[PDB]
Amino acid sequence: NPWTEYMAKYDIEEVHGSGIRVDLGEDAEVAGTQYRLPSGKCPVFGKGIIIENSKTTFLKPVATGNQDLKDGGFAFPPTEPLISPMTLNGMRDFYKNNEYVKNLDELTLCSRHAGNMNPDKDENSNYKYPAVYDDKDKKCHILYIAAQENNGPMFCFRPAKDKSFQNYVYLSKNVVDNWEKVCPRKNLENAKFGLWVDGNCEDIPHVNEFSANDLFECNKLVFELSASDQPDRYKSHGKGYNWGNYNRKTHKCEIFNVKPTCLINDKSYIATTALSHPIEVENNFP
């Protein structure tokens, strides 16, 4: 297969290895009690948490002391020294003496910064808060609340890719420092995912067709159906409907749950994944 190297970033079980819609792929202990926490190796572009219909609430600080949970968001409340939110330049200055951290790309730096804050009195606790990086403001928001969904017939909330979240990047403690090379980001224009069979790229044999007005709506649908760790039995390990072939002519999102192993050059298609940014395209067919 001449596509092996190129296609490695689309093997979501391997490269990401946890849920996408809801990432709770590991467990960590804080003072004798076990907690679930995000563990995906790739950044999730465009993911936010919608709280009771609100889109501008989840990055607000969490409720402080004698405040109700619904009165706040999910982010770290004000600290001394102020470590959240923190601009990219702020983080680079905060870590100026640490040569192993100060020059990390902004997404890895935000993950490492959130992961630096141990809530336990024990130095060996593996509990590492996730974070959201906002590309518009270049601000890392550490998330005090690691939960991503609480739905069903208060504090009701769900993960989503919404136009208001298009510049947000959801980051677990495990985001890899070379995500730019090994993780998806851009949608592939003029390409559709396929399966390599006896020297040819064959179509995915079975797909689930959802109608979609544009690429954003297709990416949103793939995200909705993607790997989810929401209730070891609950862990996806990255298995799910993580890929879609968007046909821009018929306005169809062809969603599937097997990893793709090649690309087909087809001008009617754009290849997307639940991790991918909901807008950005790359038009360089390899």
């Binding site: 907690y35 679930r36 926490l37 600290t79 951290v101 630096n116 804050m117 809530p119 005090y144």
Partner: peptide, 25 residues
């Protein structure tokens, strides 16, 4: 706990050197 409910924390100790105590407020 099954949906990601987390610990109640007021102060944090940095993991990377130099270790420092960062508290809420």
């Amino acid at each position: 706990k099954d949906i990601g409910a987390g610990p109640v924390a007021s102060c944090f100790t940095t993991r990377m050197s130099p270790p420092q105590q960062i508290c809420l407020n």
